[PDB]
Amino acid sequence: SEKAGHQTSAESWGTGRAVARIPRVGGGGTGRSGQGAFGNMCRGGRMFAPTKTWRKWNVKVNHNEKRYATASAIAATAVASLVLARGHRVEKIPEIPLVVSTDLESIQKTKEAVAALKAVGAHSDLLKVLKSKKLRAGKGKYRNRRWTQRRGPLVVYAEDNGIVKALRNVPGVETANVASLNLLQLAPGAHLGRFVIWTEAAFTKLDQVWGSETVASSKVGYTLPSHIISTSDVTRIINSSEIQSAIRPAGQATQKRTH
Amino acid sequence: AKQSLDVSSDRRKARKAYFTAPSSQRRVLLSAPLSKELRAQYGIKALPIRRDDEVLVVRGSKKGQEGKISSVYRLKFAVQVDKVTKEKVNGASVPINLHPSKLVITKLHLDKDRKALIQRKGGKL
Amino acid sequence: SVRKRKMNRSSVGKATRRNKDKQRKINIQSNPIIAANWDYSLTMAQNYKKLGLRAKLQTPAGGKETEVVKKLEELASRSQSEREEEWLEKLYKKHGDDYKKMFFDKKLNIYQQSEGDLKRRLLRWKKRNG
Amino acid sequence: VKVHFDQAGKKVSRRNARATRAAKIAPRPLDLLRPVVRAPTVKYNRKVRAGRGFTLAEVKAAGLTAAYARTIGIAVDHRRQNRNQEIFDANVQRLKEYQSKIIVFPRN
RNA sequence: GUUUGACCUCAAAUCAGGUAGGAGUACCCGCUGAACUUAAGCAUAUCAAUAAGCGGAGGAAAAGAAACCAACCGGGAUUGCCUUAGUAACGGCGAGUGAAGCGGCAAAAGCUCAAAUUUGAAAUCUGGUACCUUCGGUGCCCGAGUUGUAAUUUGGAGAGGGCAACUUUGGGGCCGUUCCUUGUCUAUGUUCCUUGGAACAGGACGUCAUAGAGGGUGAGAAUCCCGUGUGGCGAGGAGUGCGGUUCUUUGUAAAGUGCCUUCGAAGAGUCGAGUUGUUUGGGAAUGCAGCUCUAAGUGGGUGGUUCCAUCUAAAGCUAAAUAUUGGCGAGAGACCGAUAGCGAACAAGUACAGUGAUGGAAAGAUGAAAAGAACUUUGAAAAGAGAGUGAAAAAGUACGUGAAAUUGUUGAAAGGGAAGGGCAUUUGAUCAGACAUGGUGUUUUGUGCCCUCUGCUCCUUGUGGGUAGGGGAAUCUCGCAU
């Protein structure tokens, strides 16, 4: 508050009074009389640098950099090892990236919708959540952040036919329309590779949404970024027939101790 | 999950609303479930509680003990079941404050408005 | 605050108003054909494109016939006073169809109306009567 | 020091305002049919923008009357003048196309 | 008529009907107006067209339909945002001050007077009174009002007529929708085991989910209760937005459109002029006020290089976009968690202090339930002792956890006018110090996932996996048991 700490009528006692020169409250017979106000060190005093409203709360980002991030986040969902490292019990799932038939969208009832995922293999991931429901470890308990749990699968659809409502109760399961695809959903806690269940229509639409060599973009003047390398692995280049031909002979990886 | 914008998921607002609830709202907040026999007869899960009806205690130290409600202490969010009493050191008797969620009704006290309450909630007396 | 502190303290209560859901889901009111054909799950602009009708007549800032025929369906679908009629009876029986004589007449044509006024009213009279 | 925290709030405010105006002015397109105008000053004369209102002249040449024009949702300005010939042609074509599109409901 | 009667003016009343004050004040509109402080002392620049004071409003206010901006193939009420831009411009060019048109957008809505005659009829309104379907209507009476109240007109013109074999047409109920307020109904374990005083915990076994927001319940409850989610049934109000349903529509009535004909008035102690102050960063005293004088009608105001462009002052109304530390009512937070957060989580603007204006704290937590310690006993009382309740009083209305300073008691050690510290060690006290037990190589046997007979089943490339029925150790350590 702007008033907090300034709602006192203190006055400095002056020089040579055999007492500290902090501004003390006037009056008498109350206990509050003859004690320190207007000071960061004082009790009931005004804090150092009162936190103002006009702090930089929101952050401006480049729109292209923001798009790069979501493309990277999508790319990391189809790696399977990156998904396993991120969390997500994806050992018993048929393939990555996981694509389910379009009839998944039409499901109205949660009981049938969870039965679709359990048949697919996301059973273990939905048991990771629900078993990971813990109390918040802080003052977050009494600030409406009482419970905390693990993130489950994303379920990406092209167009809703009752899927958004079907899965909004099963804990951890988030849904996103392909046109959107949130970064905060795709890479939670800035860790790459959420376990993403795609739908058939969504997976085909992803070509249109982002673009490739053949198709355009659908985003105005956007292209997917180029690799500054050819291959994301170095050791095919180094342990080639080529490079190991233009190279001087090898050492021992650990020198024999001369003297 | 919360969908409506009217309802609040705030803890501070919700706890205050409960503790500073009036007697009329506390009547609904002190609801007891019916036993499986009455649920089969009347076709209803739970009702608000009153005086002259019988009850069976499910949870607590007084487990399995039954009786008839003496007085609904709505201020303390409690019922006081007769013959479920803690004997004081002076030989006197003091009733235990039970909560109606822990109780289960075995024999209802049907009045006219009580009959109407059952018929409203999809009942068949 | 001073006044708010009392209102929380009092046994009068507060004039509690829950009116936040109604600020979004607004019912259409001015057309019955639209009242049947309006998906409230969709937005304003999306509902207009679904119908056919234009939502905006200008080039909008930023980026982006089952019903209209029924409007064309509803698009597919005054006498003279007693004294006026009786007064015209007096003129017709006196002159006939001599409008020059009729407007130069003083006794029957009191308000000195032109030829065009009298003949127009006689044409309307000859439709309802002989 | 003012801060616009309500940028998100006031967009939702403005959208719901348009939603109410849509609900109350049901078949009509929220806004009036505005003209097409050549901007002033050497810098901006290449730009052609939405004007305020038509004119009595542009309305009369289109085939409708000024008072009636406002009731069918055509914004009419009376101080604007028809100096340019190309602007006059473009606006008359704009009105005539608009008149082919409109479907004015009966009063019965 | 030395009466009397019209008016005008001044009165009156405890008559009839009204209305204004005060509180609140965040925002808005006016009025008034400092100083500390900045450039070197301070007259401007500068704090500051601030704070305090004064007056006045509202849900917003104010502003507003051009006596506008422009110089272009012109824009076109106002308000706000973005930008123009830290640009033009001003400033002992320095502290620095600081716009505007255009452009993008938000929201868009325009109109009413005064102006020349209803003159073939003051066509108008107030009030009283009588009724009626009462935010009103009607009859009757009274007053206002010709020193002008109605209709018609506001420059976008407009009016008077004539011609179209022109075109259009009110109002009142009824039941619905809609809006406001309010009530009511709508899923699924109290199933077993462990631990605890208590299960909401762990474990096993299930259901519901458009409900796994939240809160309560003897500890972390989607499934116990209230809610939440999707729907449904209402009640009482508002209402002209429209849907239907009707009842009545009148009078030579009310307009609209195009052509032809005849006319055709637009605000003065104001504009402006000089000057004294105020206003600004304002260079073409900008804006305002005071004082002096004070206009024009093929007019007048404002701008552009000799003309041309642009509006029409001196009258008024008007939503929305915009502001908001107040009020009313919500929804929230990467906020604070009792020396923090408002001064105040509690008998807080209270206790209390000041003649007074005013100043103004401290202080949250027993338990699940008071089960708040009966009863015996020590003392006039103050407190104890037995005894008991509770899971725990090692929780006692001095009450959750109970830190340090500091205090007592007990035990150990040391002490001849200083202690505490570092390096090293002795003595005294004291605590650590394996539910560690094999490993290997042979030999009895006995079993099996072993040999052997017969199979069955999941899938991907051989170098697969799981899983039955018999037999058999006289070969076999292949494993495990003795």
Next chain:
RNA sequence: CACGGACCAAGGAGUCUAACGUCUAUGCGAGUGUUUGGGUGUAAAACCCAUACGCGUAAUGAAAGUGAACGUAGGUUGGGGCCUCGCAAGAGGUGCACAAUCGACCGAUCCUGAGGAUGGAUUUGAGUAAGAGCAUAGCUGUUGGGACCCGAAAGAUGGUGAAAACCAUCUAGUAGCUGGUUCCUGCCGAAGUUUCCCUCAGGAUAGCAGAAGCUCGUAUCAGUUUUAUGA
């Protein structure tokens, strides 16, 4: 000397923002910047975008203008690299950025005077050599904001009291200063001053200690000795 320390707990001091830079990272690149807004949304999130505008992309001048190829956008010299020969050591060729040298184009010079033609005199340039920016973020500097925290003599506005006062705000007033400033380790490591702005005050600079980029890694030098050549 002096100022601070009775003891203990808790509180307690370089913060936030705007303006303008520094360097590093990221995106894209002669462009770049979604977030004033509109559309959309599981709703202050995220996701899309129209028209504009911001900054940069082509310069030379003072009122008026003109405009960058004699050109592998140059001639030479060097110049990281690369290629040929050589086991090497070397040599030769091509040479990036960059540097040195000779110039040119463009504009501006000193004249010549056919209103300024034409030819000579020379230099000049955040000039062209043939674009490097824009935006976000981090590190941090400068200045203003109360501005690291606490501490001074005040005036003014409005009010209360009274045989010269007090209360409340402006006001967290202004300091040529006083006291205090909160974790560990490692590594580098001074200065005590040159000259005028006059100094007094604050600085303007050089010196000592680094940070990065560029050529080189050498014959680049040294608080030293020696010979040589003078007063």
Next chain:
RNA sequence: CGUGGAGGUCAGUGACGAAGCCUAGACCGUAAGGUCGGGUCGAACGGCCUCUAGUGCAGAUCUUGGUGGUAGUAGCAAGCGAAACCACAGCCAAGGGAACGGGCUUGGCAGA
């Protein structure tokens, strides 16, 4: 290295005792600190990859609260009962350069 909160993760720990508090207890880290045993306790909490800040105290004649020495002293015009003040102690001689000896150096000495 540590503290409050945020995202993520450890299907983390936790009434068979979380957090806190002590402890003549043990281990690790040069250290900031981290880990463990024992005792007390009664309900939430921690590591890891990141984010964020009202984040780390011995001092300010610091602010607040509490508690001492002074002291059962002055005092009340056997009982009742402060305050000022307080780094720490208070033997001499001689030297300790510097109008500095009170801690040191060398001696004399010193019993509760």
Next chain:
RNA sequence: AAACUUUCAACAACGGAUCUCUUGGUUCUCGCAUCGAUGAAGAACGCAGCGAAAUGCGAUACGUAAUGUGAAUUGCAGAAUUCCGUGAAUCAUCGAAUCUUUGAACGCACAUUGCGCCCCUUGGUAUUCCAGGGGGCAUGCCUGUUUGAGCGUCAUU
């Protein structure tokens, strides 16, 4: 040696730190417009079986009536209730009531709980008077209404 002083340890004291909680605060956003001469904001005096603040209320006094809910209130004492219903309740709702003394404060007054006036009036024959009950009497200003006044102006055989 004991005592004494000091150090350490154990157990008590003192104090309220730490941890955890939270019907509180702060900030942001959204919606709406709602005080007063019909007497408000504010002050005072009171009111419950037993009450300090708070909250509620005005001699109808922690309420009365109305409507809904349907059977409590509870710190203690004591009444109740026909509980198959005009109905418990410090319940909810709230439209009808009362609404002390004041306060813009309004009969006159100053700081007098005085100083009155008029109307309506039930009682003490009330013809005298006496008492009770009830409503009014402020200022400015507007629209009227009314009794007037004015050599203010005109008319008048």
